Symmetry: D2
Subunit: 346 residues, 4 copies
């Protein structure tokens, strides 16, 4: 007899995006920075500019106060290296787990299993707005279909994760995002799925979405021309020059941009934060020799290095382990110096 | 200044689930069949019953008339074999493409690229309701987060596709589905992602969803205890006894049900649909010898064998190629006879 | 604890779009509604001298009888089309003095089950058939939300005596696509109806509900085609002297001095047999002069009188109606008298 | 559809405002208690006089809070004789057209910023209740009450809407006591009918806290009463009170009523409010057993103005000033003290 909502415990009140947009409207200056940075990134994706996009910051945001502090330091390096590097902070609020775990600040901002999503969204949007108001553009992984309506207007670059690059509904979502999007290769190293994803996301789609007012609707997208691939390792790493060369060839064969991003962390560092510097060194070497197909890198970085299970220590990750502020200074100096040369020989 | 909905061509009106439910309420008999079949499948997932679940029918539904016809012939065999087999039809609307493609009857029911989703959802619900009214239970792939509200009440068994088994939001969805759910191994043969998915989908989750009235809300699920894995091939086929045994070991090590399903089609039968008979023969041999870990199989079958690009011929697939009615009779007789013996052993 | 505590339940309501999807307006219904709205406008502003006749049941409680009534009425609408513009009364919302059955929408099964989803569906289906067969429809707009479900099928709307003075009803009218008549107050006050025309002709902002069933701010453009309806008070107000006083008051307010006269309710003192007398008096005014009259309203059904329970087919369960025979008589009388008025131009 | 609709715009639902401005425990307690205390006056268990007093309309929250702070001293001073509740009327009905109030147009310049107005209304009501001043308002619209009814201790249905079935339905579901005014020409029967209608359960179309239309089923409002507010001639005197009470008993509803000192009872003249209150004082001294409350249009400064030039001066109906408010309240308190003394 019963066949409906058999395994639904309850359905709860959700404020629609407009309620958050009314409290936290985007400022003139945030609008300008987002607009500009999106353009600048587009220029890197299509080879019109040879600066290196650097998506850098925490694995996950679990404390907005630390995040603003981190941002203030990073901003000095963003300005310092602005002729060599386009620095954008990692501000990831949605985290895909292997089985189960804390899904992030949006899903559970009090870090205690209370799932205060209304608070989380409000907090996320507030942090993003403060970041952009101080001059730091922001990047995030879009994991969910609905959460983007709450803050995509504040995002200069989006990632689609390794676990969702093959998913049609994530490709559809990307096709309708106002920012450039990077698609990671699959968790075991499959690169073709990310190339296919760029293909798919560049076309118009019809999918089911939610309006700013919180109502489901049919969303007809125009396609996203600013997508690229991210090499993030597999069973084996894929950062080096031969993998970059292979990837580029495959990209040209698919008729899509052959400029790509390399993640220094995750499977490319064998899940070991001490190895991110090695990967960045290898990328620096490629940039010095040639490295024509590189347009960016990704780095997991925080105030304090490593990781912890409970949010005990300020500015230390509770998800993947990060390099510390001192290593970040070093890594960025390395990249800037190497890209200066690449840019010179052109 | 412009930063929002830059790559959105339009937002269109979508009737909510309750409009379709009002025109096509579930009947008492459909309700009784769905309820009973879900139970009967759960019994197979947990080793209470040793009948073989058979998920069988078209790769994709593109013509409801042919679908009802196919269903009428299948129904005779469902009855005939009911002591050995639990036959449920494949009624797949949502089709994930490699890159670009026809996404199904929901997404584009007129078969001309007009994306008439309101009509498609209505048509889908109507067919599901007729199928259940005549005594044929239905199964389908849940690809989207929102479409299930329109007809999950008519679905006795759900699949999460190979391309989405890794996706956290698909695992969340499954954790709240009222039916048993099978998770496919990854497109390159990764089994672990499916085993993880079961783990994830058995727990309670909080995520953003859409109510029957078409408004977004926070859904709190109770977890789905009736999930299992589906072996559907990878880089190599994974149907045989050794792969079954490896999978079962890995399932027991993760603490989840070690009863699984084998897909005779897709990567398991490669570039020849008729090899589905070969796979089924190998499964019959396992069932005769032992085959204690097998609880079901999946088969891509239609009125007429093969495939075509345009819907020229009646009852012939326009997606993956299917075995024809005569082979379906043979394949079902083979499975029934073999499982009769397995069941006889005590 | 201070919220929602006199509320027993909130129940599901299908939005207008669900009904519009099942029962889309046809091209012929579209055309008829659009044209009839125009033709009424013309009567309201004195461009045409045909008489608008809003005629039919006090309330609809049976769609089958309503369709039978409509088939007979359609023959007379056609016969008299040079003298009368006939539009059927299709009233689904009824205002009670205290409490009672509020109509088909509110309680379509007549048994206190308040099946509003079914009632809206039924209402829309009856309206669409009516317009498809060539009979335009009129109704009283009582509620703020219900119009989104079928106003597209309505050629003329009434705001009742009990609500002419209400700001939100004046706001609603300011945004209705049809001409609207405003009745004088239940004790005879005419100034409220003249004020209402003033209010409804202007643009307003108020809170409404979209076709998708969501609250929103609606910004109206104003309704230029409103008029008054004289429906009696403590005393009847249908005669030439009342018409003349009303016209003068309308001109003093700068609004249209063309009005409608209701033959029923306080004009007939709730005696359905007197509607014929009122119509006779209007026939006499039309023959003599009657330059300020643009329409009449009449409570008519298949069978005369009223009943408490819906036992007899085609007989009212609200106010008592004249029967089909008297309706023929009354319509012949009005058509013959207005023929002569039209001849003088 | 929509031939004469120029635009449809982006309304925040009640829950957005409730999240920013949740009701406090103290505002909760005051509202709950004051509704009870008013119920008690409606059904004749307490003989204090309900006094609904304040501006015709609220057009400036600053002056409203100033006014509230002065009124709160007198509320407390007279608490054994009078239950003072401030008039906080946002929504205003016009004869034809005009400024419809702070909700509809809070900038007073025809910008119709309804989202801002609803926010401002709720914020003022929450601040008022938090400082100890309960609030009353006219409910004109079917959707606005979802935004702030939780903060209202007493509600009025206006003379122009007492006869309206949808307003009677709305009342039947309001958590507060409700007064129904007699008709603009003096008809009392419509208000008596209204009490009858509002006391029963109804089914109608409303909007949820989330901003979605739905079917609302109400339980009926047992705490309704009539308000005598004049007609063609005034209706405040002892004979009209006696006649009204008799009509109320014949209908089987509470024969305790409220008298409005303003509007048609003062012949639209704010200087006459004091005379009316004098006549009510005299009835309270003599007997006045059927009176449970009064209404007064009062502000910081007297009279009215077309534009909001002077602070604390009405832009709608003309009000008495603060001095006269002190005098009027002292008169009512003294007279009711005696009524209460007689058993
Ligand atoms: N209606 C689904 C559960 C569901 C609810 C909300 C969603 O957004 C998605 C799925 C079922 O019971 O099977
Ligand atoms: N607002 C998103 C696009 C979007 C639209 C609708 C959705 O449901 C989701 C995302 C952006 O600016 O990128
Ligand atoms: N749809 C109505 C106008 C209307 C719009 C919104 C409302 O809430 C009410 C009425 C018409 O076209 O006449
Ligand atoms: N919230 C109101 C009752 C109400 C409910 C629904 C409505 O649409 C209007 C009013 C109260 O507590 O008094
Ligand atoms: Mn990480
Ligand atoms: Mn297939
Ligand atoms: Mn009537
Ligand atoms: Mn006033």
């Amino acid at each position: 007899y019963p066949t409906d909502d058999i395994k639904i415990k309850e359905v709860k009140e959700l404020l629609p995006p407009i309620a958050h947009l009314y409290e936290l409207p985007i400022s003139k200056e945030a609008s300008g920075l987002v607009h500009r940075t999106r353009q600048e990134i587009s220029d890197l994706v299509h080879g019109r500019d040879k600066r290196l996009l650097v998506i850098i910051g925490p694995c996950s945001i679990h404390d907005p106060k630390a995040a603003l502090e981190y941002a203030e330091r990073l901003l000095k390096l963003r300005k310092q290296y602005e002729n060599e590097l386009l620095i954008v902070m990692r501000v990831y609020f949605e985290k895909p787990r292997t089985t189960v775990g804390w899904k992030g600040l949006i899903n559970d901002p009090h870090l205690d299993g209370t799932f205060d999503i209304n608070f989380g969204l409000r907090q996320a949007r507030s942090l993003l707005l403060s970041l952009n108001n101080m001059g730091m553009p922001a990047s995030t992984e879009f994991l969910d279909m609905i959460t983007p309506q709450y803050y995509a207007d504040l995002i200069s670059w989006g990632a689609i994760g390794a676990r969702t690059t093959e998913s049609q509904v994530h490709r559809e979502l990307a096709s309708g995002l106002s920012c450039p999007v990077g698609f990671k290769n699959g968790t075991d190293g499959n690169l073709k799925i990310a190339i296919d994803a760029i293909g798919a996301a560049s076309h118009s789609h019809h999918f089911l979405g939610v309006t700013k007012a919180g109502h489901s609707a049919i969303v007809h997208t125009g396609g996203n021309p600013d997508c690229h691939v991210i090499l993030r390792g597999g069973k084996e790493p894929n950062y080096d020059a031969e993998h970059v060369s292979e990837a580029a060839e495959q990209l040209r064969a698919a008729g899509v941009t052959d400029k790509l991003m390399i993640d220094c962390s995750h499977a490319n560092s064998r899940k070991d934060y001490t190895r991110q510097m090695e990967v960045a060194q290898d990328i620096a070497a490629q940039l010095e020799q040639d490295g024509g197909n590189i347009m960016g890198v990704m780095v997991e970085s925080h105030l304090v290095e490593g990781r912890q299970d409970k949010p005990e220590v300020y500015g230390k990750s509770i998800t993947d382990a990060c390099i510390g502020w001192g290593a970040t200074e070093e890594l960025l100096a390395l990249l800037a110096g190497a890209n200066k040369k690449r840019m010179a020989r052109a």
